[PDB]
Amino acid sequence: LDPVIQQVLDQLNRMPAPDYKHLSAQQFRSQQSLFPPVKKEPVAEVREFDMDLPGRTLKVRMYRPEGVEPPYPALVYYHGGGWVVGDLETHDPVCRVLAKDGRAVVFSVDYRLAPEHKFPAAVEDAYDALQWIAERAADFHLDPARIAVGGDSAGGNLAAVTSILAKERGGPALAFQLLIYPSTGYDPAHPPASIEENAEGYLLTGGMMLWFRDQYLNSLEELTHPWFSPVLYPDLSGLPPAYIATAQYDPLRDVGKLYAEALNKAGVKVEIENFEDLIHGFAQFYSLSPGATKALVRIAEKLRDALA
């Protein structure tokens, strides 16, 4: 286990174990704490504006890197945070790396967070967002055939699910899926080993996964709805080829593996790598941990090839 990630787990695992029974979303958000300033790689331009969508307006932050000419290969990105926390700044550095090392224009979408907007506001936001952007490939000098989707954790979930809607509705063409330790689901009655294995002490805990699933979902029945567990979708076949990264000490390790294992079955090209010395959410320790820094770049490179 990485040395910097260790001090974070030690110092963290000290404070009192949280009481998710009374813990509030306002309080977890206001509880922003853990993640000192981090390095922001540079890019040619950064543009933040509003996507005006029916019923609601969403903020977007576009990232163009240096040394890349139109029409540009892109990436519509969805930040992680349990469908509850996170915004355009918390993941601003991660997006900068994917943009710099991935050689693509990155559009980080500021979707509606729960509990305020329950499932499925996030999913509809993810899909409508991609469409709003693809409809205007010409206005952003985009190569319509090289537009990918990606995300970390809950953001990874949204990307998998958006891939599926796009397939039902015949487009827009998604060239690729970049899923970083994504929450793609499973059958709660028969949960993978990593769930029990890495239940505690590794940042993302079992009690935290439950709290998220609580603030986000409306009913128990929703636990097996495809839009929440894309892994339980009928025909995974014909979906965009993908790259899936997982972490050794992540309760969601086998969940992503399970998704890799499923797309393969429906005959979809997929590559999955497990980073042996990292935990869930490592991309946010870029420039802080020597292991996370290497992994994120490695991940941004796979994007570069895939979209090449």
Short description:
The chain is an alpha/beta fold and 308 residues long. It is 33% helix and 19% strand.
Helices and strands in order:
Elements: H1 3-12, H2 25-30, E1 45-53, E2 56-64, E3 72-78, H3 92-102, E4 105-109, H4 121-134, E5 142-152, H5 154-168, E6 177-180, H6 193-197, H7 206-216, E7 242-247, H8 253-265, E8 270-275, H9 290-307
Parallel strand pairs: 3-4, 3-5, 5-6, 6-7, 7-8
Antiparallel strand pairs: 1-2, 2-4
Helix pairs in contact: 3-9, 4-5
PDB class: hydrolase
Keywords: alpha/beta hydrolase fold, hydrolase
Assembly: monomeric
Q: Give the neighbour order of strands across the main sheet.
A: 1-2-4-3-5-6-7-8
Helix content: 25-40%
Query: What multimeric state do the chains show?
Result: monomer
CATH architecture: 3-Layer(aba) Sandwich
In angstroms, what separates the terminal alpha carbons? Answer: 33 Å
The main β sheet shows up as:
8 strands, mixed
Strand content: 15-25%
CATH topology: Rossmann fold
Q: What's the helix-strand series?
A: HHEEEHEHEHEHHEHEH
Radius of gyration: 18 Å
What is the overall shape? globular
**What is the count of structural domains?**
1
What is the CATH class name?
Answer: Alpha Beta
Number of strands: 8
Keywords: Hydrolase
InterPro entries: AB_hydrolase_3, AB_hydrolase_fold, GDXG_lipolytic_enzyme
GO molecular function, one term: hydrolase activity
Protein name: Hydrolase
Question: What can you tell me about this protein's structure?
Answer:
It comes from Alicyclobacillus acidocaldarius subsp. acidocaldarius. Belongs to the 'GDXG' lipolytic enzyme family. Pfam families: Abhydrolase_3. The protein has nine helices and eight strands. The chain has one domain (1-308): Rossmann fold (3-Layer(aba) Sandwich). Strand 7, helix 8 (253-265) and strand 8 form a beta-alpha-beta unit. Helices cover 33% and strands 19% of the residues. Helix 3 packs across helix 9 and helix 4 packs across helix 5. The protein has helices spanning 3-12, 25-30, 92-102, 121-134, 154-168, 193-197, 206-216, 253-265, 290-307; strands spanning 45-53, 56-64, 72-78, 105-109, 142-152, 177-180, 242-247, 270-275. An eight-stranded mixed β-sheet has the order 1-2-4-3-5-6-7-8, sandwiched between helices. It has 308 residues and is an alpha/beta fold. The protein starts with a helix and ends with a helix.
